[PDB]
Ligand SMILES: NS(=O)(=O)c1nc2ccccc2s1
Ligand SMILES: NS(=O)(=O)c1nc2ccccc2s1
């Protein structure tokens with residue numbers, strides 16, 4: 001079974017041995033070189049439509065924590081921007097570091113942020129998530145950088161439940177959470193074709209990375225770092241540095257929605 005992780009012996013540099021697409025042509029994340037990225041006037045404004053979102057549950061999956069949504073109908077969707085059609089929000093999760101100087105997956109002119117939020121959506125034309133990941137336009141992931149400064153009020157409900165899902169396989173009710181409280185003011189973005197950043201690393205994602213980071217407090221991110229990779233009663237391994245480094249851009253163009 002799957003035994004990949006972010007440890008000293010099963011981290012990103014090992015993944016290719018069980019997931020050979022790790023060395024593929026459209027892997028994520030990437031470094032965003034802001035001077036090479038081209039303004040594309042043909043891109044549209046994003047439409048983030050989360051007014052009817054229905055969060056359900058939060059889970060420690062042994063790699064991160066994920067907040068899951070009801071994706072059995074169009075409730076919270078992403079449209080527009082580089083996308084054709086409608087993409088349903090299935091879950092969000094974060095990647096973060098052991099200290100504030102690393103944690104993001106994407107980088108901007110080689111700068112690493114303290115963490116990165118991924119809101120994961122799937123293209124409804126394929127009917128279910130499992131079919132969507134097998135298609136080059138199957139997923140859209142909205143990525144948002146976190147820097148450490150002032151607290152993010154809309155994140156606090158998430159941090160306050162983490163004590164209850166400390167170890168792998170623990171979950172808790174997480175209804176009535178509004179993900180709009182995790183967004184920055186501006187929806188200016190970069191976009192490029194890429195992949196899932198954890199195994200199976202499938203090349204099925206249209207990445208939309210917001211230019212404006214959100215600010216979270218040191219206290220908030222410190223609570224992320226108290227989670228465990230391990231299961232209950234097992235030797236404690238703090239859940240930190242659960243990010244994949246930047247991968248080769250190869251023959252891909254990063255486009256900007258803004259001038
Ligand atoms: N990262 S992986 O190729 O999927 C993997 N690494 C390791 C290391 C030790 C035991 C099993 C596995 S499975
Ligand atoms: N980190 S991510 O590219 O947003 C992502 N990776 C995976 C892997 C398996 C299932 C869902 C997702 S969402």
Ligand SMILES: [Zn+2]
Pocket residue numbers: 093094095118197
């Ligand atoms: Zn992710």
